[model samples]
Target: LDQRIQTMVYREIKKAVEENNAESGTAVLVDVRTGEVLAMATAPGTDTFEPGSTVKPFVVLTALQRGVVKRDEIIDTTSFKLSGKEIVDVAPRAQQTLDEILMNSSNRGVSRLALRMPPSALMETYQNAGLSKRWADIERATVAYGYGITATPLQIARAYATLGSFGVYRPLSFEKQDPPVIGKRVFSEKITKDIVGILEKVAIKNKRAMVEGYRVGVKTGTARKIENGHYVNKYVAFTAGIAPISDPRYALVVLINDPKGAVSAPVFSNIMGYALRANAIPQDA
Candidate 1:
């Protein structure tokens, strides 16, 4: 990691979080091609959070890989109740394509899609994505939408790196690799492409996340924090994405906890902008 870039990222993250009176925040950037961790920082580095909707991509990818659903399948996104609980969409559409489900971050759509998969497969997919094992029906469903599971910012960044690397799950290296390391196959390239395409739409819809010189494919997440064995009003916000979508060169994740006003997307943009420029990485051509 370049010291200049590291300092820039840390400073920006702190500024963003502090401006909003946040409790803590973390950010990471990795060279997607080499498994090298360019920068990894956490304010209260030990902090972790329930990832919220950020985990939706893995569930959708697993279903696609397992032949449970096709990319083009249309799902009814109207609010509904499941397992005695009502689930709703933030921006509901009467009918949503698989890609649209993710674009809208619809809880109902992901819950329904997750239900279509066998429990064993869903669990396996989560484990494969580096999540610890969890059971119970409601817990499993919640896992689909990123509840009942927790991850540090570094862990979240590494998971997004897999998507950027075209389904290869590589071990993150803080030190540069000599010959470069290879990663295990988690999903096929085709599935990765499909998911990345959907993420691209997410970025486009979130105009604030669109960097001027690059195509950013990202997902934003907002989750309520749990404390003392119960849910708290405190919220954690984040944005995880791959830069230069045509040929991803970096995977970035930025997270902030208990912020009064700050969100992760703009903070992510500021950090990513520095990384791309500092490294002299060319714009998507």
Candidate 2:
């Protein structure tokens, strides 16, 4: 890992906290192919909080792998109720496809996809990808939308790296290695390929997270802070995914906890934009 890249990642986190009024923040960047942590900084240092929509991709992958839903399946994304709470699509319009489910951050859309399978499948899929953690009568639905669960930015980044490498799974590395850390396959390459293709369009409308010349696959979340066993207004803004999708290289996660006005979307853009230019990854946007 290069010292300069590390400095940049950490500095951005600080910028968000100091300038944007966030309580604290962190970011991790790793090689998608090898899981080498090129740079990771817990902005002045770090939490386990709800991940919001960030975890939905895994749920989508689970459904795809289990054949519970087809890629082009016209998912019935209409509003529905689960566990006494009415799940709604916050988007201006409903999303009926997996691609729209993610890009729109459709709660109704994703929950439908998740509930099609048994809770065991989601837990297994999540555990394998390093989620390693949830349960419930309402849990299967909450888990689909990223409630009743917790994760640190680094762990989330590690999970996203699995997507970056086309489903090859490996533990993260902080220091350079001679032989390079080999990994096992957790998800099929074809499935990951399909997911990556969908994620590529996620940040397209989120101009804040866009890297001008590169096709970046990103998903952002704003999770409520749960403390003392209850939800709080304080929120965690997250932007996590892979970059330069065509030849996937870096995986990054940026989080700003309890931001007054700041957002993680732009933080992701700044760090990832610098990363791509610094590493000279091809501009395939």
Candidate 3:
């Protein structure tokens, strides 16, 4: 039978999933710069899952854009204000830079801040960030925290790709053309550049030894299983990133759905690291 590279990749992925050889139910890859579909495979029409702490980076960038705080502003991790309530910040209260906040995936820290954001502002910020184009449930705080909202592996990939575009917020065109259509700018270049500089630092930091030397920045997420029309304990895995951080060229997004044997976010992280290495991105300790 005759086929294309994309078809070959898709067939292999499908075969692997059918045989339970691949824990990931589906896989997809695209060119971040050109929105070209290199490979795509999925088990059927499956709904997207709740994007977990992986969304922290976007939220952090949003807060920065709104003048809510500075990259190095002192946020009392031990004690802080959120939603008109004073909650004890369980995470260590140390001086965390905008980059550190993302590397650590500090939920208590970011959620605390998110809860304080005006709902309308958060929604607008998400739309500006290029996520609302695919997933719009972000209108609420729970979804912002990765609980109520759901997104597919590809949609999640697009969101990260958008982020990698330095907040330019463009719509991706999958088909090949003389001149590919790129996403548009939702936020000002000034804000986008500032956030890009901050996020680009995430890959090399020691504490986040997940993928260093790649000049990489990343976020991880998962969704609870939806059962009886409600979300349950079932889970999905995800990791989205930009590699060769210094002069960003490629962005990658990977996801593994409901690893029946073992469900873990780190699995996605390890795979993402491998993707970076495969692309010849540095991984120095």
lDDT of each: 0.80, 0.81, 0.55
Candidate 3 on 11-75: residue-level lDDT in tens?
A: 54454455544345655555556665545556542356666765666677677777787767765
| Residue 17 C-alpha lDDT in model 3 | 51
What tens digits encode model 2's per-residue C-alpha lDDT throughout 186-234?
A: 9978998888887878878676887878988888878887677677778
Residue 186, candidate 1: C-alpha displacement in angstroms: 1.4
TM for candidate 2 is 0.92
Residue 135 of model 2 has an lDDT of 46
Least well predicted 10-residue stretch by lDDT in candidate 3: 260-269
Candidate 1 ranges beyond 4 A from true positions: 133-137, 226-231
In Å, residue 216's CA in model 3 sits off its true spot by: 2.3
Tens digits of lDDT, candidate 1, 211-235 = 8788889999798775655567789
TM-score of 3: 0.71
